[PDB]
Amino acid sequence: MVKKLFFILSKEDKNFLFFLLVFSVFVSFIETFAISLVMPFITLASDFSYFDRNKYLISLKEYLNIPVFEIIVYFGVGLIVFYVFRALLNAYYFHLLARFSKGRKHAIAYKVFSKFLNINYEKFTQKNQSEILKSITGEVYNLSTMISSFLLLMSEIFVVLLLYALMLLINYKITLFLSIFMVLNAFILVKILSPIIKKAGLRREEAMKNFFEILNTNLNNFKFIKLKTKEDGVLSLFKAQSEAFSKANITNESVAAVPRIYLEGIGFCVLVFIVVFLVLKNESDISGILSTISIFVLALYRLMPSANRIITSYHDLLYYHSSLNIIYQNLRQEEENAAEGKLSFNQELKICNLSFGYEGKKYLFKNLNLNIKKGEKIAFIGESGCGKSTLVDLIIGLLKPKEGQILIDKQELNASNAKNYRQKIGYIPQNIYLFNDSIAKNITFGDAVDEEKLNKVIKQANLEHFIKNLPQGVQTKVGDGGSNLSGGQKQRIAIARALYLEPEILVLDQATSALDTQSEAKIMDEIYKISKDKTMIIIAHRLSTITQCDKVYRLEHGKLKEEK
Amino acid sequence: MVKKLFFILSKEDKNFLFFLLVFSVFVSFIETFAISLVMPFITLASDFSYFDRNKYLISLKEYLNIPVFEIIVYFGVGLIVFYVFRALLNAYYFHLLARFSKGRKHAIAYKVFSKFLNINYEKFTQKNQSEILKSITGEVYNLSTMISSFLLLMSEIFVVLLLYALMLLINYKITLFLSIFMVLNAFILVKILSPIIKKAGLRREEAMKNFFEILNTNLNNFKFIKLKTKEDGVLSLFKAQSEAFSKANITNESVAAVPRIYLEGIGFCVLVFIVVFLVLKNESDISGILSTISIFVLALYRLMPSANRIITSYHDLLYYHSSLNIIYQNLRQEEENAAEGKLSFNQELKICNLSFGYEGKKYLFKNLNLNIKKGEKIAFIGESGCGKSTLVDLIIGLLKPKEGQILIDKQELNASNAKNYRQKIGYIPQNIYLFNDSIAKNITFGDAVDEEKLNKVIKQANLEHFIKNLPQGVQTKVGDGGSNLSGGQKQRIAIARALYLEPEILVLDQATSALDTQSEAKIMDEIYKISKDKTMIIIAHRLSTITQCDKVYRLEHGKLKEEK
Ligand SMILES: Nc1ncnc2c1ncn2[C@@H]1O[C@H](COP(=O)(O)OP(=O)(O)OP(O)(O)=S)[C@@H](O)[C@H]1O
Ligand SMILES: Nc1ncnc2c1ncn2[C@@H]1O[C@H](COP(=O)(O)OP(=O)(O)OP(O)(O)=S)[C@@H](O)[C@H]1O
Numbered sequence A, B: 001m002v003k004k005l006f007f008i009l010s011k012e013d014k015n016f017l018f019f020l021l022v023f024s025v026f027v028s029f030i031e032t033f034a035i036s037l038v039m040p041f042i043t044l045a046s047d048f049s050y051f052d053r054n055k056y057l058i059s060l061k062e063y064l065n066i067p068v069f070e071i072i073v074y075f076g077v078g079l080i081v082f083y084v085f086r087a088l089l090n091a092y093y094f095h096l097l098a099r100f101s102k103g104r105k106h107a108i109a110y111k112v113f114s115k116f117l118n119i120n121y122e123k124f125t126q127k128n129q130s131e132i133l134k135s136i137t138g139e140v141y142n143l144s145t146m147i148s149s150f151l152l153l154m155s156e157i158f159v160v161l162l163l164y165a166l167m168l169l170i171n172y173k174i175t176l177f178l179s180i181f182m183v184l185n186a187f188i189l190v191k192i193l194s195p196i197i198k199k200a201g202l203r204r205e206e207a208m209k210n211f212f213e214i215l216n217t218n219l220n221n222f223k224f225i226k227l228k229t230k231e232d233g234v235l236s237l238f239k240a241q242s243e244a245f246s247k248a249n250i251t252n253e254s255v256a257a258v259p260r261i262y263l264e265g266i267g268f269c270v271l272v273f274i275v276v277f278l279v280l281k282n283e284s285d286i287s288g289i290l291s292t293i294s295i296f297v298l299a300l301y302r303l304m305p306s307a308n309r310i311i312t313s314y315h316d317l318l319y320y321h322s323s324l325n326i327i328y329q330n331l332r333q334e335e336e337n338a339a340e341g342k343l344s345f346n347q348e349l350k351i352c353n354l355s356f357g358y359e360g361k362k363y364l365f366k367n368l369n370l371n372i373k374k375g376e377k378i379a380f381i382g383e384s385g386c387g388k389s390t391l392v393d394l395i396i397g398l399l400k401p402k403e404g405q406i407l408i409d410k411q412e413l414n415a416s417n418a419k420n421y422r423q424k425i426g427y428i429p430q431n432i433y434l435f436n437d438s439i440a441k442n443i444t445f446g447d448a449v450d451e452e453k454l455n456k457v458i459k460q461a462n463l464e465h466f467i468k469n470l471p472q473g474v475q476t477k478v479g480d481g482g483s484n485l486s487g488g489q490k491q492r493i494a495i496a497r498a499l500y501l502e503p504e505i506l507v508l509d510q511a512t513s514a515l516d517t518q519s520e521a522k523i524m525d526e527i528y529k530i531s532k533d534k535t536m537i538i539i540a541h542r543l544s545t546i547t548q549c550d551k552v553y554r555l556e557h558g559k560l561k562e563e564k
């Protein structure tokens, strides 16, 4: 509830919140002071006689440091300076409310992005890209406006309490008498309304998750969709969620419209009813009706905006927060990797008693055993679907094992040191995403540029012929996902991606699948003649690539075994 | 600027907008009549002496229908019914406002997504996926709330004009005084705030664009990012743009808080300055001291809200509108497709004179010639990157030739019939995206489920062993993009995709590169004994796939020439 919120906000944001609360109560005081100092300055106008009666207003004349005219100047300069001060302080306080609410987007977005980027590769494997995007994009933004709404609610409730006391001071009767009436009005405005808004907020978050998923997947299949001609079906399924989302939004905004209107109608009708009941029988009279009706209308007119603000802010905390702040609570309590150990690999790499399965699946391995000395260059062959890429995703730093250990020079590879060991692997993942930028990027993956190293890596992946006759050269852009390229070009850029990384273990996993037999020959011949200081792992369903692999292993419905 | 806005809105909600202008004029009328009618209703309080003077008010006392005390009761029921009526009128108006303003999300969004789904496949190729995701949820939302802002600007300038019209009648000189005063204050407010807001809104749009892409692409390379360890420099790239975006919104909100503050402060100041200007040298004796302060303050207290409204609303139209209203105008003028004619393919598929390069690039073909008789089953082979997939993308629906024709049974394939033509393609891509749902869907790709057909297609892609020993079998979900599978399982599913579609041209383009020699034998053997009624096109770097093909062509820097 609020505990979820105070978990989301860091140990510095809570401090900002308490600071804004104190600033809020103070600004409440100052605005009460403004609306209260309206009256005395207003009264010393057509009738200066108020300087001759009232005990608290007649003591000022006795000073006689000024005659009778010169009182209003000492009143006026102070009044206008206090109002200048009011305007400036309110500007500052509103700018702070901004700095807090709209800055929560930055405060929380990158936090959720970190929590996502840091989870285990398989923990991410069971996640959903579109929901991630919906979190860091839309949900944190609703959370930010929700922060602003909760904050504005707190400031306005403090204003309400201070006005409540100030109205209790003078004519306690009407003040307490009206407090219960307006509170009951709020009770029926909330009880009758709030379920609507909660249901609509649930509707809207669900619809948003939906149309995020639908946009993402159908764009990711655009070509097949254009072949199958069913663009209109995708569009129809999108129209579904868009109508749902928009309908919830319109119900929310119209709800948020109704409380001001209700307060207006009910308060005006009860004012006219009370005066209609007073025309015949009146509990106050002469100078008594003036006071009661005037202080009454002023207090009511000042109060109603605050109360509308209160109700609308709580309903907003129901619309977003409820169906949405949960979506962040559940996202910052996630299994995150850790640690910082370094590891050395100068002899061998034993597997030992592995055994593995996915978070709720049957085992693929069950105490298999294997060991790769530095520079061995082994290769796993099997039938499609038995568990090769899984085993290798296990040998490298992803996928913690279920029984075994994996040892790097007889040293267990665990969370404590898996970072520095991951730093050793160049992958080439068989199906490869290239982010739309330069061919220089992707290859480097952002990490510096060694011009001659990059040209070495370009030549080694026999890309030299491809970049040389592009117009912009190495700087040529690649298209989204690598769509502006061919297949073999995409995979050569992945091979070179990994070669730039430096070696110390070089996985393959169908790295030459999109190349012919001949380009693959060239690439394997340029690679083998450099992979004789590091070890490497070759996964290829087609032969020829494994011609220079020394030991050839083969998985089965049981553990793997050697083969020559 | 507004022409854009009326392009985005259809010939319906354009007329709905005219309707809402009318209704906002009416609500303005009733809203001003409310306060105006409260004034002659408060006039009959402590001193009942106004029923005997003023020419317009004494013409009803001696109607003699009722004594004089029984007048206030009829006036009172008038007031109660009118005020509940005003409540209901405002309810309906604010509902229509929310429904139109927050309702534009649905219609506009599905229109943009329709546009993007309907562009030529190459025209799509030169688009970024993330920009599309943003211009379909982030910028549509950013257009909806500010459609609301445009509405409010129109309604409030209309009510301000009618309110000035009333002030012109009742008390003329201070009317012009306040008019000059507050229009000049609004003007300085606008000319000082609006550049800040334009700059900020440009910054917010730019941040948001850069800020979606990091999310998209790094989520798409997650595996590599965790392997290279660089899983927070990514987070740093995000932190930059999230901070920029948040600061932008900070400036927006803190600015929009300034007009209201400046207006209320300066208004209290003009009240006090006019009364202190009045005390010593007064332009009115005995009369007008109250008649010109009461109505003047009571109407300034209503002009200030609508003035702040107009100012901050125009400023919203600066912040968001410039940023994404332009994006939308731009994303609605875009090349769509067309077509409706039918194509019958019972003999040959001539290509003839086929020239093509990508929209700005050098040519890849230049009048190659081919003619695939029905059922021929040919196959393309070339070196990685010479463009066989481009030729295939031309021979199926997408991709329009620069000079060629492509003739189906001696009928020109063009955008009058390409729809029905594409209907005949079973694709199978190089890289397979399986959206994350049932293994039945993907294979079906939505089009219902015909049991025997699904199972026969499963068994043809030898996936039957897989979905047998699977827990939920043909129902087990596939994971994001097919992540929860193997590459070969993904590929055989895509084979099942193209099989389930019915035949009539069966493209492959390395449909078996992720499968072993034996399972590829199995798949091709299953296919060739069913593809002897339809035609097909294999693109395979590895041999053996092309064993049973009839004619095998080869692509070069020039055209393609047969090979046997
Ligand atoms: N989506 C695209 N947009 C623009 N240009 C492209 C695109 N795809 C390919 N090209 C150009 O066409 C040439 C080869 O493209 P492809 O048709 O992918 O090659 P391919 O030989 O069919 O695929 P491979 O290498 O055999 S798996 C390249 O030089 C590119 O410049
Ligand atoms: N990310 C994942 N999440 C859940 N299950 C998975 C995942 N990856 C693989 N599996 C399962 O584990 C088995 C082995 O997966 P892979 O390692 O992809 O097989 P493979 O031997 O690499 O396949 P190929 O075609 O030879 S690359 C498959 O049957 C999958 O059902």
Ligand SMILES: [Mg+2]
Binding pocket: A486, A487, B388, B389, B390, B430
């Ligand atoms: Mg290709």
